[PDB]
Amino acid sequence: FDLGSRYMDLKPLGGNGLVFSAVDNDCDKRVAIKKIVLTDPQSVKHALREIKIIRRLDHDNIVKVFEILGPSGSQLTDTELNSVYIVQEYMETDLANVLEQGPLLEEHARLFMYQLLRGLKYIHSANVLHRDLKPANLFINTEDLVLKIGDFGLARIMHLSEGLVTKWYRSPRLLLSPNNYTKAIDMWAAGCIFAEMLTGKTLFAGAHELEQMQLILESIPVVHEEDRQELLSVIPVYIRNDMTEPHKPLTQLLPGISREAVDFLEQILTFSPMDRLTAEEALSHPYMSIYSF
Ligand SMILES: COc1ccc(-n2nnc3cnc(N[C@H]4CC[C@H](N)CC4)nc32)cc1
Q: Report d(CA 216, CA 205) in Å as an integer.
A: 9
Strand order, beta sheet including 93-94 = 93-94, 138-141, 146-149
- Does 200 carry a binding-site annotation? no
Pocket flag, ligand 1, residue 19 (CB < 6 Å):
yes
- Does 17 carry a binding-site annotation? yes
List the chain domain ranges.
7-88, 93-284
Q: Report d(CA 53, CA 203) in Å as an integer.
A: 30
Task: Give resolution in angstroms.
Answer: 2.9
Query: Ligand 1 center to residue 165 CA distance, Å?
Result: 17
- Does 19 carry a binding-site annotation? yes
Query: Ligand 1 center to residue 138 CA distance, Å?
Result: 9
Domain 93-284 in CATH 1.10.510.10:
yes
Q: If you ran DSSP here, which 8-state letter would residue 105 be given?
A: P
Contact (CB, 8 A) for 169 and 134: yes
The arrangement of secondary structure in 7-88, i.e. its CATH architecture, is 2-Layer Sandwich (3.30)
Q: Report d(CA 23, CA 27) in Å as an integer.
A: 8
Method: X-ray
Catalytic residue ranges: 132
